[PDB]
Amino acid sequence: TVHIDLSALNPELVQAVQHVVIGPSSLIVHFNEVIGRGHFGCVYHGTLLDKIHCAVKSLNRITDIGEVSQFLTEGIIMKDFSHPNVLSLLGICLRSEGSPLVVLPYMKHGDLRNFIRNETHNPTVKDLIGFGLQVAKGMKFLASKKFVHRDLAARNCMLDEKFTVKVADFGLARDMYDKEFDSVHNKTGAKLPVKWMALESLQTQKFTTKSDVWSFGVLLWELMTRGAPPYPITVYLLQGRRLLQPEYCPDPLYEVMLKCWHPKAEMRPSFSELVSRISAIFSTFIGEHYVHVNATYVNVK
Numbered sequence: 001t002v003h004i005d006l007s008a009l010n011p012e013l014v015q016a017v018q019h020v021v022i023g024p025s026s027l028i029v030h031f032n033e034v035i036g037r038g039h040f041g042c043v044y045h046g047t048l049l050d051k052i053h054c055a056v057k058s059l060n061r062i063t064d065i066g067e068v069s070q071f072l073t074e075g076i077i078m079k080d081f082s083h084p085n086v087l088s089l090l091g092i093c094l095r096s097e098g099s100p101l102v103v104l105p106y107m108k109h110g111d112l113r114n115f116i117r118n119e120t121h122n123p124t125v126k127d128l129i130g131f132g133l134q135v136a137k138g139m140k141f142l143a144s145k146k147f148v149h150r151d152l153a154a155r156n157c158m159l160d161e162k163f164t165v166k167v168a169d170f171g172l173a174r175d176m177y178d179k180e181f182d183s184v185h186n187k188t189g190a191k192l193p194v195k196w197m198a199l200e201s202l203q204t205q206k207f208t209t210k211s212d213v214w215s216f217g218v219l220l221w222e223l224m225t226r227g228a229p230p231y232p233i234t235v236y237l238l239q240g241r242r243l244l245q246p247e248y249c250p251d252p253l254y255e256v257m258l259k260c261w262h263p264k265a266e267m268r269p270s271f272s273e274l275v276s277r278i279s280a281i282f283s284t285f286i287g288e289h290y291v292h293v294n295a296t297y298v299n300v301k
């Protein structure tokens with residue numbers, strides 16, 4: 001029931017965010033065409049004009065000026081996170097009574113996990129490695145900004161009409177699949193995706209680019225299994241265990257996954273090194289090896 005007067009925002013902040021703001025005459029939200037919903041609010045199809053098909057994330061109302069301010073600040077920072085393998089922020093709107101919109105690109109093929117799981121899709125080893133390379137490129141960029149993702153997973157990357165992978169679920173593009181999984185940014189989550197988290201993250205809450213590299217290794221395993229659930233966990237890993245080599249995963253790529261899960265965080269490869277190594281492995285394939293699900297992983301949750 002709380003009224004919020006947005007004129008209480010700091011005028012310097014309002015000026016600073018203007019280049020991120022999409023005016024109402026430039027945006028049509030297609031309220032009859034829902035893309036998906038969660039605790040956060042709802043994502044609708046949209047049209048943005050100079051037209052362009054977009055996704056409009058409508059957040060629950062914000063009634064605290066400090067929280068509004070943090071949202072605008074995040075908008076300014078995220079607007080500069082521009083890379084072909086990172087989901088872009090097209091802009092924001094803040095309507096009467098604190099009703100926020102985050103305008104994002106529309107991703108024809110949805111999330112990467114569902115895409116590779118779909119039986120009607122026929123990926124090759126080359127394709128799946130190429131998806132992994134794209135993710136490594138997006139992560140190299142994020143790491144260059146000193147940004148630690150925490151939430152890297154196949155479900156949190158999206159695929160557009162050109163089959164370009166965009167690392168997602170960060171910044172104002174957070175809250176992906178928020179009924180299935182809590183964010184690794186949530187200190188007290190009851191549904192944390194522990195199967196993607198580095199050992200030192202599980203044990204001592206240390207989150208770094210090197211723990212992102214661990215998550216990336218799990219993501220590579222997701223790709224090569226066509227979206228099996230990992231380990232179909234701290235005590236398990238400490239027995240001396242890792243994810244098994246996928247049946248269609250090339251040996252050099254499995255060696256890379258093992259490096260990503262090095263027990264010493266400092267000894268894991270950088271995302272720059274991963275882009276280099278995976279680019280080389282990718283280049284050896286010609287698209288003749290079709291990848292299928294492991295019978296013992298099908299339908300496992």
Ligand SMILES: COC(=O)[C@@]1(O)C[C@H]2O[C@]1(C)n1c3ccccc3c3c4c(c5c6ccccc6n2c5c31)C(=O)NC4
Pocket residue numbers: 035036037038043055057104105106107108109110111158172173174175176177178
């Ligand atoms: C139940 O679905 C989800 O929770 C998603 O994370 C998954 C689903 O909508 C959610 C809410 N989602 C989101 C949750 C939070 C922010 C963005 C999204 C989101 C986006 C897109 C899509 C999408 C595209 C095609 C099919 C399904 C799609 N979804 C999204 C986006 C998109 O194209 N761009 C952003």
